[PDB]
Design a protein around this ligand. Structure first.
Ligand code: MET
Length: 309
């Protein structure tokens, strides 16, 4: 039996959003206009490039709050607005306009990881599963009712980069399914449970410094979560050394956090609060990322056992 076609305004900025606009362009839905952030140092956003390529009208208001930028929305005559990593706020007046409202594709399984960095934070906290949630947008920050969710396992080697890639494929599927339910009137909205809510904070160069008072397993999560950016690091001999890969080894003899337990071709083993961090792939400033073997060959003195970082 026949599905239905909606007129849609799409609002998004980054690659994650462009992959959603791509699925929409391939669907039977009608994309009447695309909102995206103003060009920044000047570069057009991936969404803009994709929209222009397909000849869709692009709109780049600095703000949607001022009352007559709101006519941009009203004149497009849309059933719904789809919002993916747009980056500007939708005031109540705009949320109010589309016949079916505004929905958002969010990069976690809500209520968990509301906010700026849900993909990175889910890796960082060692969640077994993450996912995407299709949400009916409302006043608050990622507080809206949940229309649809799809799960994704976080694998042992998943970084923020590889998980981003998985969720960019999953999100468009969830969005398409949800659009069909909203067009047919079959959707079900689930209120978020506020006690399960957590916030996902942006990463910082400050936080990327390896903290030896955490457990080995937490640090290894950090190394994956902080890849591609900021990239976990530690300091030795007044030099920053980026850490790309590590492993988590069983607690041995007691030792003070930060102590080098062993250094060899195997890795560089560092004591933590709980268990041992074996650091297997490292990046000195100005050099290509290399094995422990490579770095120890050049700089053994940095890693003499019993020394503390
Ligand atoms: C880009 S507007 C929505 C922001 C919100 N943190 C979300 O991605 O769900």
């Amino acid at each position: 039996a026949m599905s239905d076609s909606l007129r849609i305004i799409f609002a998004g900025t980054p690659d994650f959003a462009a992959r959603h606009l791509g699925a929409l362009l391939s669907s039977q839905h009608k994309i009447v206009g695309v909102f995206t952030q103003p060009d920044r140092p000047l570069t057009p956003s991936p969404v803009k490039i994709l929209a222009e390529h397909h000849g869709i009208p692009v709109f780049q208001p600095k703000s949607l709050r001022p009352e007559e930028n709101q006519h941009l929305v009203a004149d497009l005559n849309a059933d719904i607005m789809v919002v993916v990593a747009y980056g500007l706020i939708l005031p109540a007046a705009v949320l109010a306009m589309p016949r079916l409202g505004c929905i958002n594709v969010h990069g976690s399984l809500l209520p968990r990881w509301r906010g700026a960095a849900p993909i990175q934070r889910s890796v960082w906290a060692g969640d077994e599963k993450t996912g995407i949630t299709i949400m009916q947008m409302d006043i608050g920050l990622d507080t809206g009712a949940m229309l649809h969710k799809i799960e994704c396992a976080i694998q042992p080697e998943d970084t923020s980069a590889t998980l981003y890639d998985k969720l960019a494929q999953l999100g468009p599927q969830g969005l398409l399914i949800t659009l069909q339910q909203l067009a047919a009137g079959t959707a079900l909205a689930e209120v978020q449970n506020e006690t399960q809510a957590t916030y996902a904070e942006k990463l910082s160069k400050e936080e990327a410094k390896l903290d030896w008072t955490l457990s080995a397993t937490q640090l290894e999560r950090c190394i994956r979560a902080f890849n591609p950016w900021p990239v976990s690091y530690f300091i030795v001999d007044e030099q920053p050394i980026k850490v790309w890969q590590a492993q988590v080894l069983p607690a041995g003899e007691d030792a003070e956090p930060g102590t080098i337990i062993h250094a060899d071709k195997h890795g560089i083993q560092v004591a933590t609060a709980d268990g041992v961090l074996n650091i297997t792939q490292l990046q000195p400033a100005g050099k290509k990322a290399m094995s422990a073997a490579d770095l120890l060959n050049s700089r053994r003195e940095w890693f003499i056992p019993g020394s503390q970082l």
